[PDB]
Ligand SMILES: *C(=O)CCCCCCCCCCCCC
Ligand SMILES: *C(=O)CCCCCCCCCCCCC
Ligand SMILES: *C(=O)CCCCCCCCCCCCC
Ligand SMILES: *C(=O)CCCCCCCCCCC[C@H](*)C
Ligand SMILES: *C(=O)CCCCCCCCCCC[C@H](*)C
Ligand SMILES: *C(=O)CCCCCCCCCCC[C@H](*)C
Ligand SMILES: [Cl-]
């Protein structure tokens with residue numbers, strides 16, 4: 001599905017800004 | 030370094046497309 | 059229409075990464 | 088050069104908005 | 117609501133390109 | 146300076162997420 | 175405003191320029 | 196998870212911080 | 217075309233590569 | 238300005254808040 | 259090319275139009 | 280790390296796969 005993929009693209013960008021030096025793991029559904 | 034921060038934002042968006050359903054980990058430090 | 063325009067924005071970014079040095083032509087509907 | 092690659096990602100997104108329904112071509116080489 | 121937030125993300129990027137040196141004020145609903 | 150222009154595009158997207166419903170102002174000059 | 179107009183229809187560069195300072 | 200929560204409602208910075216390492 | 221195929225289903229890297237020059 | 242302060246050095250999330258409305 | 263002209267100096271919105279179809 | 284390997288030189292699509300889960 002496309003719109004969930006689009007939301008995920010902005011999601012990882014938000015996580016990159018918020019997490020910073022700590023980093024993050026991104027796991028989709 | 031701001032240039033390092035800008036590069037990381039493109040790395041996470043590249044990982045999101047490349048990995049797909051697998052997901053990815055971003056760990057600078 | 060807006061949501062198709064939004065999907066196209068992420069589409070050309072994906073094409074830029076995948077195509078690389080070959081380049082691409084983007085033509086909307 | 089990574090800085091060249093980062094710049095190209097902003098060029099394609101700029102072309103997508105500027106050209107609109109016309110579309111665009113991205114040819115670095 | 118999510119999809120309006122997603123459209124706003126591409127909206128401010130478009131405003132940054134179009135406005136240039138003049139700048140802009142972004143105020144959501 | 147192109148590098149300044151590229152940095153500003155990441156500044157506006159950072160402000161959009163950070164400020165939220167408050168909104169933001171981008172004024173380089 | 176800008177969300178109402180440009181998130182329901184595709185705004186051209188001239189329409190986007192209206193919200194500039 | 197993160198898609199279920201933050202793609203149905205707007206997640207604030209604190210909510211996004213929950214998924215950090 | 218590319219909008220019809222890849223904005224209704226998630227296109228993989230190989231599918232996206234089809235539209236390259 | 239935001240360019241002279243956040244593009245020469247990395248601005249934290251709190252520093253970016255100084256340019257919110 | 260667009261890289262040699264728009265990545266070494268800032269290209270205006272009109273200059274980017276030269277690479278539209 | 281990914282920063283020391285992909286921000287100093289361009290990482291191909293296959294090299295980015297090394298950091299997938
Ligand atoms: C308007 O032009 C803003 C005035 C201050 C601009 C400072 C830009 C400094 C040049 C960039 C240095 C870093 C390049 C990687
Ligand atoms: C294909 O490789 C394009 C040929 C011209 C490339 C010019 C790149 C110049 C190097 C970047 C200089 C600016 C770095 C901040
Ligand atoms: C955490 O700080 C990562 C450790 C390695 C960082 C390397 C950054 C090198 C400086 C940037 C050089 C290129 C600038 C255009
Ligand atoms: C992946 O298979 C997605 C799994 C979660 C289901 C998402 C869709 C749920 C119903 C949404 C309907 C709205 C779009 C027609
Ligand atoms: C440009 O005119 C778009 C042409 C393709 C039609 C897109 C819409 C098809 C029906 C989708 C309905 C879902 C949104 C209400
Ligand atoms: C913030 O509260 C949004 C206020 C504007 C209302 C947006 C939704 C209007 C109806 C859209 C329905 C389509 C999605 C189910
Ligand atoms: Cl950049």
Ligand SMILES: [Cl-]
Pocket residue numbers: 006007064065122123
């Ligand atoms: Cl979107």
Ligand SMILES: [Zn+2]
Pocket residue numbers: 035039093097151155
């Ligand atoms: Zn960038």
Ligand SMILES: [Zn+2]
Pocket residue numbers: 006010064068122123125126
């Ligand atoms: Zn989007």
